[PDB]
C-alpha positions in Angstrom: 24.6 36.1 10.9 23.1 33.0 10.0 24.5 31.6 13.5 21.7 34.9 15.3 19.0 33.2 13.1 19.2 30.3 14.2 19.0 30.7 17.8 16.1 33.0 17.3 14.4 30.2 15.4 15.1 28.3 18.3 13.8 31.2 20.9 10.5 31.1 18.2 9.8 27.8 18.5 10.1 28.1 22.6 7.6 30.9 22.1 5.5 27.9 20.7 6.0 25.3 23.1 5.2 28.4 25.9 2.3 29.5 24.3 1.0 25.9 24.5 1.4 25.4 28.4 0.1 29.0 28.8 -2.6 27.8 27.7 -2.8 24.4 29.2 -2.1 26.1 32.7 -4.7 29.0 32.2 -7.8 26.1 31.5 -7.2 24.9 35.1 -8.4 28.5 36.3 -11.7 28.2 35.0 -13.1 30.7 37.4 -10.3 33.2 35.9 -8.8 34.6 39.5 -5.4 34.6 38.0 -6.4 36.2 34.4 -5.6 39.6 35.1 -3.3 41.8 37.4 -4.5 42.2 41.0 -6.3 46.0 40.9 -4.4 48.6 42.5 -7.8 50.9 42.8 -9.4 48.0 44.2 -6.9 46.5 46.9 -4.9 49.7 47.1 -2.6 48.1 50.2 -1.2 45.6 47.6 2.6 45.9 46.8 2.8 46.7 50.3 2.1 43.2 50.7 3.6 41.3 47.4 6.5 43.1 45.8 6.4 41.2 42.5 2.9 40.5 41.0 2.1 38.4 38.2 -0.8 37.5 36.5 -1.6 35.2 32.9 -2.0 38.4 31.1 0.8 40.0 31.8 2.5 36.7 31.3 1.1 36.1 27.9 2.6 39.9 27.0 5.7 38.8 27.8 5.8 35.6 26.0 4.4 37.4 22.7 7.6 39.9 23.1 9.7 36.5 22.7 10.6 37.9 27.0 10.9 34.2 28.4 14.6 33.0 27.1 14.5 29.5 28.9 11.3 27.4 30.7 13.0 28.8 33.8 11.9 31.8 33.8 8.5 31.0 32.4 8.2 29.0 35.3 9.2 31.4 38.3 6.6 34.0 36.8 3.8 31.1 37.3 5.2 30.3 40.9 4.8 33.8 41.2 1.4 33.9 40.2 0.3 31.1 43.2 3.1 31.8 45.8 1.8 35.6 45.2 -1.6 34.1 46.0 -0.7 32.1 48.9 0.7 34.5 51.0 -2.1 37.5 50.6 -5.1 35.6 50.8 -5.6 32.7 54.0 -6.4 29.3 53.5 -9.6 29.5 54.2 -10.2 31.6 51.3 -11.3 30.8 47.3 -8.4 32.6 46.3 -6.2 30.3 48.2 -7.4 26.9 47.4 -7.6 28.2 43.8 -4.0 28.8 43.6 -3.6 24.9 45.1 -5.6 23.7 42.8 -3.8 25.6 39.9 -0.2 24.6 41.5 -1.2 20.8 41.6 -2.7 20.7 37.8 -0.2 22.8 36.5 2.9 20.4 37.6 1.5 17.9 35.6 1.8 19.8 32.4 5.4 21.6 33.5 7.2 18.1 33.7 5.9 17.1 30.2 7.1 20.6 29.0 10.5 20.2 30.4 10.9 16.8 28.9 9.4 18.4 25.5 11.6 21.4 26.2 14.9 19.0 26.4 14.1 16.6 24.0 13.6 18.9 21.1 16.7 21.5 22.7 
């Protein structure tokens, strides 16, 4: 139907906008501790610990599979990402204050994206 084209035009151009903030979010890990999935041969105790990882990579799969339907559910896999962060590593820690310091950039671009996101529908 025309109607199912149109709302995947719409789900397309979210792709776009997502791709965008992806990005935007992934430049304030310069040191890349978020880039890829926490190694299972290497910390082999982990989903003992976290039962939902996340990662940019595996985020950036979903988004190019059209997967994220709303900003909401972009969003929760990013909180995922530092929340995941937060509780396996102590403050004290790189890992940690990396995951602050992505959390407090990253708000700044996800409230022009939800503006951007509502504006355009």
């Amino acid at each position: 139907s025309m109607e199912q084209v149109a709302m995947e035009l719409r789900l397309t151009e979210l792709t776009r906008l997502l791709r965008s903030v992806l990005d935007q979010l992934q430049d304030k890990d310069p040191a890349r501790i978020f880039a890829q999935p926490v190694s299972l041969k290497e910390v082999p105790d982990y989903l003992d610990h976290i039962k939902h990882p996340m990662d940019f990579a595996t985020m950036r799969k979903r988004l190019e599979a059209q997967g994220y339907k709303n900003l909401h559910e972009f969003e929760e896999d990013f909180d995922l990402i530092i929340d995941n962060c937060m509780k396996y590593n102590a403050r004290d820690t790189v890992f940690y204050r990396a995951a602050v310091r992505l959390r407090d950039q990253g708000g700044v671009v996800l409230r022009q994206a939800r503006r951007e996101v509502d504006s355009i529908g």
